[PDB]
Amino acid sequence: FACKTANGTAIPIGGGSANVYVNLAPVVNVGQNLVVDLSTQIFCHNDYPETITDYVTLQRGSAYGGVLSNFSGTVKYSGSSYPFPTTSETPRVVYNSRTDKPWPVALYLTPVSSAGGVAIKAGSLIAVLILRQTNNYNSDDFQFVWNIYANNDVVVPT
Ligand SMILES: OCc1cn(CCc2ccc(O[C@H]3O[C@H](CO)[C@@H](O)[C@H](O)[C@@H]3O)cc2)nn1
Numbered sequence: 001f002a003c004k005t006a007n008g009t010a011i012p013i014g015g016g017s018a019n020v021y022v023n024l025a026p027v028v029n030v031g032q033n034l035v036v037d038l039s040t041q042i043f044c045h046n047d048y049p050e051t052i053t054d055y056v057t058l059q060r061g062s063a064y065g066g067v068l069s070n071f072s073g074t075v076k077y078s079g080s081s082y083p084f085p086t087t088s089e090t091p092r093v094v095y096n097s098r099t100d101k102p103w104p105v106a107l108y109l110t111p112v113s114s115a116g117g118v119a120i121k122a123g124s125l126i127a128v129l130i131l132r133q134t135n136n137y138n139s140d141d142f143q144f145v146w147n148i149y150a151n152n153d154v155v156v157p158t
């Protein structure tokens, strides 16, 4: 089991960490959502699906920088919604093919009433999402740590 990002980098068997840059809507008002869909960027596969089933959860989602201070949010993982930052590990998604399949995670972030001006700075760390992988074969229990960075400034009009 390993993962990669689109035109990007890879995290190999056994886990590790990688940096991911996302495009964000440049202007977002109170009451609106920034939607950050990682399922178009992060892809994973099972290396021996004929005998092994891989189980994959969102172990934890954490907010940083402008997102931590200026937004509240929710995360959608494989069809279900949760608070973001997260309050517990999600249920598991099964990976049973050598063909790349998206990691089905999306953040929905909305400005708090005190956000104004530049609420997220270009290039800044905005979130960490930890993918936890196990299987039905041995004791493997691995973390794939995705550091999520803003590509551009996000302004909350005042
Ligand atoms: O007849 C038994 C047999 C065994 N195999 C492959 C053995 C194997 C063992 C571990 C393994 O590890 C990687 O691949 C596994 C499947 O994705 C994953 O669960 C592991 O954690 C790890 O990333 C891959 C192949 N093929 N046939």
Ligand code: NI
Pocket (backbone or CB within 6 Å): 002, 045, 046, 047
């Ligand atoms: Ni592989």
